[PDB]
Write a protein that binds this ligand. Sequence first.
Ligand code: NI
Length: 341
Amino acid sequence: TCPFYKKIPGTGFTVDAFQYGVVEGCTAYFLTHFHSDHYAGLSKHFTFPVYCSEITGNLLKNKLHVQEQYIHPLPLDTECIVNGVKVVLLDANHCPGAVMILFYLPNGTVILHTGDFRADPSMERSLLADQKVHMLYLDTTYCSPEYTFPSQQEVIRFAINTAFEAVTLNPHALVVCGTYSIGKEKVFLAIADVLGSKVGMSQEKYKTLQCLNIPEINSLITTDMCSSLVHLLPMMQINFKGLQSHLKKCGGKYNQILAFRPTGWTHSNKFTRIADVIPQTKGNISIYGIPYSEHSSYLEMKRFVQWLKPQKIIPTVNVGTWKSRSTMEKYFREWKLEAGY
Ligand code: NI
């Protein structure tokens, strides 16, 4: 059965609620983004209206085979009426096609559901600036002050320079990048661009990337592995065993692998600056773990909430333990007292 924090009161609506069968009273099912914990349940047999972005719609249709008659794409930054209620979709600065949803309830209440987001000061000049928000359903993934990490821009700079240096010293090195879902595409795109190569990958991954409306994509990616010196592999294969094995397959073209594992936060963030990061190395293989986050840091989250000044906050992440819930409510009360709302 569907938990309370995925229901929108006073509407027939749910958010990211596909794993509970037919939800009683639900006339429209919203999907914030194409990540498996959120779409869990959807398939070609689904027969209720799905509301989402254009990109999320391309993924539903081509990867999960949802029939076209049930996919309702909405443009961003545009007031839309759905089953008699005004809604707006806002870019969430998460993965491609990820949105936040503003609902304008018939009784005058205004609700913002962030889905998964990486809060940015540029959100303070969207359609959020115009008006008041009574309830916030918040992505609280990293709602604790230990969670620090650099900007996405600093992380990409480190990856581009690392890769360019290696391959310039050794033109026979191959670069490999791990992936398990959409998001974080800039890692492998930025590296391929500095090296003047396409990104090589499996047919299934190429399919997924073709659904994302990335400009000039046919110029950037390929299924011909042999022509490419940046390859993508599943994240599970980014280890000394998996990579030795991949190197065997390349037919005596390369004599070194440099690989990148984009992760979220890891404890080595509590001591080490991005500039000071070093790989794990076995022979002619080196692996860099790099902290490329598509979720708010603690400071980014705090700044957004202090700016928005919501009357009530409902977390959507880390809700399963008493200690987590208690920790989150303490931070929300500090933020409110410090800022005066
Ligand atoms: Ni996500």
